[PDB]
Structure 1
Amino acid sequence: ARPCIPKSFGYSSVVCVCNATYCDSFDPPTFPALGTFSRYESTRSGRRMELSMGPIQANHTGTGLLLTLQPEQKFQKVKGFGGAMTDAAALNILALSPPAQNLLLKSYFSEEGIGYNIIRVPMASCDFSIRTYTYADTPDDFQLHNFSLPEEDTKLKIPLIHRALQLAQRPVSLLASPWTSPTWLKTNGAVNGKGSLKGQPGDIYHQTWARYFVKFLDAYAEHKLQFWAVTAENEPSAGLLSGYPFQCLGFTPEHQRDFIARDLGPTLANSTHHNVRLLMLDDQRLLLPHWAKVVLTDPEAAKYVHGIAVHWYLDFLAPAKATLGETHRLFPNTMLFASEACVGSKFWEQSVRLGSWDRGMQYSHSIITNLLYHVVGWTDWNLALNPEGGPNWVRNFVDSPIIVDITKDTFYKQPMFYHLGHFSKFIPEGSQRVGLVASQKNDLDAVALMHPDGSAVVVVLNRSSKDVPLTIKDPAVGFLETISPGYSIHTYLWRRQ
């Protein structure tokens, strides 16, 4: 409804500029009339989810690329898409004027924006905090009498989450993850560095830690927030590394298995929060299938584990077939869920690259690859950062789909935002991935889903410089004659009946 105001920062594409009085917006999604398709197009050249429509033809002839929908062939159902309400994100959002804040929140959470339905919530401090703290810093408080939410939660994160929920028309699922325990529960007595819980699963340290999860959920429940899921620990492999720079808590897969079986599983199950899902791993997919095998082959751990959460940071050296594919094969009834991604965290990556088309393509390529290998959802990291990629108490700066420029009471929506939206806006919870097969080898990334009502949604990414003419065949409906321009992403929608 309102066009992108483009600005170049000298990278491959433009950001869209928003402030207190203006932000680009979309219309709520709709399917067009039977016999017509919709196309939403974003390009490096600056098109931002532009709507066009076309006819579905009864016939097709030619030798060009054909993508054929296989609507009967069903895969995973989609949980959703969203991002993380870190301390850093909360600070950046609230540093904007109230009108600008509302436009940012609407960008993500309204149907005039990209319809996020997941928010990841850190349990106390992480690197994307300006303060190191837990919820129970009073030493040796095994009873957790001094457990409490600080202002980071009560003043910053919780009110923003409530505002996001008000804007969202879709049901929103909250996901909680801890980085570190209180230091008095840890072998190293520090928030960072190499260190695990003291002792062994089933003991006082482990029982206290499990009870901390319940205290956290109790406290958020007092604030009228309920959780869909928690993870067992953010990046448990991190705490195994000498000199790890920020908040962590080390678990081997054996340690995680035993913690879930003995402490976390029984504790949650015997609480008012028994319906909250537990996700294991919450770490790089390079650790699969090994980690899934260790945890899920133990029935006492398995009965508590709803899903496997994966992070994207080692995807470049962990092929999806050998990790996601093999895990799905062995454990087809345990969902895979992508719970954290961002560009900028790597040694060879600058933190923020305003307007980078490459980083947009990284997001969409990742989401497509995940969807093609059974993953049910995909979650960004910080919802918003400043132009430095912070704040961050160890200066571990990274990129974010929205960058906030407080001096100008402005925020910039980057290619990553639009790439994510090509999925989030058009794929409601309960959509199902269906087959889509190419007639010939090609440079495109594509995925097909069936909307809950039976309609079709297809996303096509072209990471190459070359325009690719193609046809999409829906055997029941007809043919879509289209093009995939170089450096474009398209979302196709059409009714099937």
Structure 2
Amino acid sequence: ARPCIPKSFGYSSVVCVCNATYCDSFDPPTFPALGTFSRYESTRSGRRMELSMGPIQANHTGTGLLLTLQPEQKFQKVKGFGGAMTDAAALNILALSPPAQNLLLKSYFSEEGIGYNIIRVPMASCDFSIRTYTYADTPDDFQLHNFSLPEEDTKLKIPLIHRALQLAQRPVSLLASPWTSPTWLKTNGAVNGKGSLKGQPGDIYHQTWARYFVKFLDAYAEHKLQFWAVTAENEPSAGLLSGYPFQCLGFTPEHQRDFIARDLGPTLANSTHHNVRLLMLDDQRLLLPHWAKVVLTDPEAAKYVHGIAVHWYLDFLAPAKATLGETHRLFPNTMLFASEACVGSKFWEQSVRLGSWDRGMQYSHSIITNLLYHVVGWTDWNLALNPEGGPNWVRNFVDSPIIVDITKDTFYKQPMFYHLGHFSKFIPEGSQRVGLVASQKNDLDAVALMHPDGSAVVVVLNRSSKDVPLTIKDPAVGFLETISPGYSIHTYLWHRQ
């Protein structure tokens, strides 16, 4: 149940060093006894998911901040938490010695780690690949007779995915996203740039691209991997832009609507993988609510869409209410999902920044707002990167929660990995968000959920320099008195009955 081993790389906080024989970890999880709460803390100063336990008192006299649970107010059920098995992530992980590979995967996927239950798999290459390739690169192969998985799947991604699922006790859901199609299906003849599918929904190009999905699933299935969902297309808006630098395939909302309706919906249904769900959008949430309007108000497309997938860059800011909120209002039965998230780049920073507390707080802060607005799940980008933040074929640099230093056979767990963990570890699939009324204006972000077994979890992130005394109230049991240290993140759990 070993503790963190800290190193400062000169920024606001430390990272935790793992290596072939040592990684920080958890005792197998356990519930506190009735009358008591558990609290996990992580701070800028260096505390990393330290377990302390406390009393639920029957009394409180104001008037510090009070957060009141409203066990009555239901909201979204919760799908899960996870990240992406990008080519680069696979590569960095396999470049470490076997035993360090497992401490790596346990960190993410074990119950002794942060219990991830989602993995996003790209369908052939993205920008975290070291070459551009699709699974059907033979020109005019409308039948897809030359469709095959390269080594990047059969040797890197796929094996790693089996390993991850073995380590994990929680069932894991796989999510696929393609970035680009073969270039012979694309008006512009290249993996990138402006350009969309050739022709017209309904036609041969469109039928082929949809069969391509079934092939992807067929091929993955002979390796004993099944998918929970696919998405219609990564960042479809990206491919509508002149000079776009990585792999992509443009869709306007109309094009996407028609593609799903006339092609991808039916092709999926007629195949043995009909159970696989489909998500639309997979893009920046500012395209909302309009993108959903367009697609979903067509019953032909709607019978086919299970949910809407969104992205955010965390250095930036959207309102949320106007997007996710409004979207929920209009389509309260099509689940919002965050399918990709990540931090820049500033530009004055510096893609990987080892031990940055800021980048930690943005993850949690964005996870909180997302849960506050009906989002059922949250997927990180690359599971691992190197210290340059690659490999990337096109030099697009971003950070990752785990950083691999192949030359030292070590890997660093970043603050990000831990703010992610405050949720991933304590909110299993099934959890239902429920209400949490603040007694008054405050700087804290907080959120409450209930496990499938009635029990309670609350996450509190504090982004001020100042400490904030506070009480959480729960009617069925009482008051919890605590502090949120400035620059802290806490998770509280307690039994209710």
TM-score normalised according to structure 2 size: 0.99
Deviations 1:284-334 (A, max 9, x none): 000000000000000000000000000012884421100000000000000
- What's 1:262 paired with? 262
Contact 1:285–1:315 (8 Å) recurs in 2: no
Aligned equivalents of 1:299 and 1:347: distance in 2? 43
Secondary structure of the corresponding residue to residue 250 of structure 1:
coil
CA contact (8 A) 1:284 1:315 kept: no
Distance verdict in 2 for CA 1:223–1:457, change over 3 Å:
same
Q: Summarize deviations over 1:168-225 as a string: whole Å, max 9, x none.
A: 0000000000000000000000000001000011110000000000000000001000
For 2:216 and 2:152, how far apart are their aligned partners in 1? 14
Q: In structure 1, what is the Cα distance between the partners aligned to 2:422 and 2:7?
A: 21
Q: CA deviation at 1:372?
A: 0.1
Task: Answer whether contact 2:78 2:431 (CA < 8 A) is retained.
Answer: yes
Q: Secondary structure at the match of 1:312?
A: strand
Whole-Å separation in 1 of the counterparts to 2:126 and 2:376: 26
Q: Distance in 1 between matches of 2:465 and 2:314?
A: 26
**Conserved in 1, the CA contact under 8 Å of 2:37 and 2:55?**
yes
Q: Structure 1: how far apart are the matches of 2:314 and 2:416?
A: 19
Deviations 1:380-399 (A, max 9, x none): 00000000000000011210
1:374-413 Cα offsets, whole Å, 9 max, x none, are: 0000000000000000000001121000000011000000
Question: Aligned partners of 2:19, 2:283: CA distance in 1, in Å?
Answer: 36
Counterparts of residues 75-224 of structure 1 (less than 5 Å): 75-224=75-224
1:194–1:349 Cα change, 3 Å: farther
Could you say if the C-alpha distance between residues 342 and 188 of structure 1 is closer, same or farther in structure 2, counting changes exceeding 3 Å? same
Q: CA deviation at 1:29?
A: 2.4
Structure 1 residue 344: Cα displacement: 1.9
Residue 384 (structure 2) aligns with: 384
Partners of 1:481 and 1:204 in 2: CA distance: 64
Q: CA deviation at 1:31?
A: 1.5
Q: 5+ residue gaps in structure 1? A: none
Residue pair 1:56, 1:479 contacting (<8 A) in 2 also? yes
Native 8 Å contact 1:177 1:233 kept in 2 = yes
Query: Distance between the aligned counterparts of 1:261 and 1:466, measured in 2?
Result: 53
Q: Give the distance between the partners of 1:345 and 1:441, measured in 2 at CA.
A: 32
TM-superposed CA distance for 1:449, in Å, is: 0.1
Give the CA deviation at 1:349: 4.0
Structure 1 residue 26 displacement after superposition: 1.1
CA contact (8 A) 2:314 2:362 kept: no
CA deviation vs aligned residue, 1:425-473 (integer Å, no higher than 9, x gap): 0000000000001000000000000011000000000011100000000
Give CA-to-partner distance per residue, 1:327-364, whole Å, 9 cap, x none. Answer: 00000000000000111255454211000000000000
Q: Report the Cα offset of residue 27 of structure 1.
A: 1.9
Matched residues in 2 for 1:30 and 1:460: separation?
20
Whether the aligned pair in 1 keeps the contact of 2:4 and 2:23 (CA below 8 Å) is: yes
Residues 477 and 496, structure 1, Cα contact 8 Å, conserved in 2? yes
Distance 1:53 1:104 in 2: 28
Q: Deviations over 1:467-488 (max 9, x none)?
A: 0000000011100000000000
Provide the identity percentage: 100
- Higher mean alpha-carbon deviation, 387-396 vs 336-345, is at 336-345
Q: Judge conservation of contact 2:86–2:128 (CA < 8 Å) in 1.
A: yes
Distance 1:192 1:374 in 2: 33
Contact 1:286–1:315, Cα closer than 8 Å, also in 2: no
The 1:101/1:50 distance shift into structure 2, 3 A limit, reads: same
Q: Distance in 1 between matches of 2:191 and 2:30?
A: 48
Question: Take 2:30 and 2:244, find their aligned partners in 1: how far apart are those partners?
Answer: 47
Tell me how far 1:78 sits from its aligned partner.
0.3
Superposed displacement of residue 496, structure 1: 0.4
**Residues of 1 paired with 2:383 and 2:345: CA distance?**
15
Contact 2:315–2:362 under 8 Å retained in 1: no
For 2:355 and 2:142, the matched residues in 1 are separated by 49
Kept in 2, the 8 Å contact 1:391–1:397? The answer is no
Aligned counterparts of 2:404 and 2:64: Cα–Cα separation in 1? 44
User: Is the contact between residue 314 and residue 342 of structure 2 (CA under 8 Å) also seen in structure 1?
Assistant: no
Q: How does 1:459-470 map to 2 (within 5 A)?
A: 459-470=459-470
Q: Does the 8 Å contact 1:284/1:314 carry over to 2?
A: no
C-alpha contact (below 8 Å) 2:315/2:344 kept by paired residues: no
* Number of residue equivalences: 497
Question: Is the 1:125–1:134 contact (alpha carbons within 8 Å) kept by the matching residues of 2?
Answer: yes
TM-score (norm 1): 0.99
